């Protein structure tokens, strides 16, 4: 697989230097890594970090392209950019699935940090965290479907380690915690529902934030296991209770509270 990886990497470099679309190339390359993972073979780190750099560069270029383009090309660029985001997620899953050295892990963390601070968003507004914890995140029908499973407790911890905005919101206002609570396989998968909830909570997720329809994470929980497990990790605070009472009683909080507190009552 070494020769195939090297040839694919050279082709990807040649296509990238020519300023051409590489979402399909990155997708096929991640499919190749997933197929190699499914065969239980040792994985090199330098190609992983090189393709991570290529993927973050391609996602930046896709954002640049979709920033101003025709409407049919808007749809094409949005589809290709979301596909690039998904392929970056698959690459992060591959990176965290294999064993890497300290400097290689540092370089991978640097690339993920660069993409996270780039702040990518899909059509619905899912960041990298809202997709790594979403069970509705699409996985390609090829070999990526074998090892890249979402929600993943290792991708999320990697994104939290690289500093993803934990309290980020979708177009509906759903945090990264409003999405993992409504997981449909709590008992079957009480290792990526526990190691994610206990990761988001300790990374600074407000376990009381309200989305656009005013539903807290334990109010947006479709299963009883998530409610039990979220209420264990959640911590009480008088700023949360008082803001919740302000929102519930429909009190006018406009210009009678600090500007940094008008946002706090915005979602609590």
């Amino acid at each position: 697989f070494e020769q195939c990886i090297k040839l694919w990497l050279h082709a990807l470099h040649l296509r990238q230097k020519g300023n051409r679309n590489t979402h399909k190339d990155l997708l096929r390359f991640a499919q190749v890594f997933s197929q190699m993972i499914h065969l239980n073979e040792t994985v090199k780190a330098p190609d992983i970090e090189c393709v991570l750099r290529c993927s973050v560069l391609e996602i930046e270029q896709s954002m640049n392209r979709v920033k101003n383009i025709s409407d049919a090309d808007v749809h094409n660029a949005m589809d290709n950019y979301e596909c690039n985001l998904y392929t970056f997620l698959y690459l992060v899953c591959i990176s965290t699935k294999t064993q890497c050295s300290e400097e290689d892990q540092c370089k991978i963390n640097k690339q993920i940090y660069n993409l996270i601070h780039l702040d990518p968003r899909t059509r619905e507004g899912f960041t990298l965290l809202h997709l790594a914890v979403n069970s509705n995140t699409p996985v390609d029908d090829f070999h990526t479907n074998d090892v890249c499973s979402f929600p993943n407790a290792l991708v999320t911890k990697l994104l939290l380690d690289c500093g993803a905005e934990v309290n980020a919101v979708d177009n509906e206002g759903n945090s990264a915690l409003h999405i993992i609570v409504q997981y449909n396989r709590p008992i079957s998968d009480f290792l990526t529902l526990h190691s994610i909830i206990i990761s988001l909570v300790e990374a600074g997720a407000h376990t009381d934030m309200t989305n656009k329809q005013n539903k807290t994470p334990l109010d947006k929980s479709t299963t009883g296991v998530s409610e039990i497990l979220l209420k264990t990790q959640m911590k009480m605070s008088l700023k949360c209770l008082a803001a919740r009472a302000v929102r519930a009683n429909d009190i006018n909080y406009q210009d009678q509270i600090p500007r940094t507190l008008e946002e706090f009552v915005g979602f609590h």
């Binding site: 008992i187 998968d189 009480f190 290792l191 039990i228 209420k231």
Partner: protein, 157 residues
């Protein structure tokens, strides 16, 4: 139907149930093809039988299909059978505890992290309300298992 559910083939089970078969009929000991579908880990067969109202009844050993699935470290089948609109708290927590215990001592499915996590999940489900708190029926200590008298508190767990 019982042997079809016990095997890994679900098309035959679907064809049988599509013509109003007997998913509530008893086998030798107690099996209603649910105790056989929830033995090798065939989630689709369990789903099909639950959809056509195969009912939950104890076998000759007093083992519900949920408890049989929990005994064989079948987390998927336990997840499916814990959502039945009539499961009861005592059965839900005993199935979770049995699943966690089964993960501790097994060869094909040996996970001690899953053991602790399912035991803790069933513990938190016991101790959540304070009022009408569910307490564990701790058996007297057994010399074979050291001298541990179960874990009826989350602190010792």
């Amino acid at each position: 139907l019982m042997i079809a559910a016990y095997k890994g083939h679900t098309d035959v089970v679907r064809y049988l149930l599509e013509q109003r078969a007997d998913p509530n009929a008893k086998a030798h000991c107690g099996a209603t093809a649910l105790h056989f579908a929830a033995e090798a880990g065939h989630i689709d067969i369990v789903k099909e039988l639950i959809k056509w109202r195969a009912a939950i009844v104890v076998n000759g050993h007093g083992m519900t299909p949920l408890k049989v699935a929990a005994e064989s470290c079948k987390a998927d089948v336990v997840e499916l059978l814990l959502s039945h609109a009539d499961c009861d708290r005592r059965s839900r927590i005993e199935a979770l505890e049995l699943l966690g215990a089964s993960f501790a001592n097994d060869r094909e499915n040996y996970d001690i992290i899953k053991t602790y996590h399912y035991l803790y999940l069933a513990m938190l489900e016991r101790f959540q309300d304070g009022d009408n708190i569910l307490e564990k029926e701790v058996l007297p200590p057994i010399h074979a298992y050291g001298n541990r008298t179960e874990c009826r508190n989350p602190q010792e767990l």
